[PDB]
């Protein structure tokens, strides 16, 4: 996948956003912007050019699942890759992510190596 792919990292916790942004940088992905919830995310997505979303599951105003469904049902970004992050792997949340079209699913905290594995699985599936 292109090194200049523009990521949006979504989480209401600034530290986690920084951590994910830093892991992305570690993998060579420098084009990264942040959003603090689903609403803020959708607002920033309007600037256009975004090629990948990483979103936390629980956020105020609009959570991760709500954001994911909105993106998937949106005319312009329905095919955007979306990696969902949760605090715990549960059958219910995994199946909820599957039904909504999550491109990937990962439990935090995760290493750069894990992030890389998840991104690569998504790139492969999408032919990126």
């Amino acid at each position: 996948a292109d090194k200049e792919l523009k990521f949006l990292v979504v989480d209401d916790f600034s530290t986690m956003r920084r951590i994910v942004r830093n892991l992305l940088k570690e993998l060579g992905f420098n084009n990264v912007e942040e959003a603090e919830d689903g609403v803020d995310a959708l607002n920033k997505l309007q600037a256009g050019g975004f090629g990948f979303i990483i979103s936390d599951w629980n956020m105020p105003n609009m959570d991760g699942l709500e954001l994911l469904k909105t993106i998937r049902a949106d005319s312009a970004m329905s095919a955007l890759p979306v990696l969902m992050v949760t605090a715990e792997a549960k059958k219910e949340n995994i199946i909820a992510a599957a039904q909504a079209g999550a491109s990937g699913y990962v439990v935090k905290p995760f290493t750069a190596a894990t992030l890389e594995e998840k991104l690569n699985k998504i790139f492969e599936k999408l032919g990126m």
Partner: peptide
């Protein structure tokens, strides 16, 4: 874990 790990694999996650 078993089903979780299997479920994940099945979904390609």
């Amino acid at each position: 874990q078993d089903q979780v790990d299997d479920l994940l694999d099945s979904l390609g996650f």
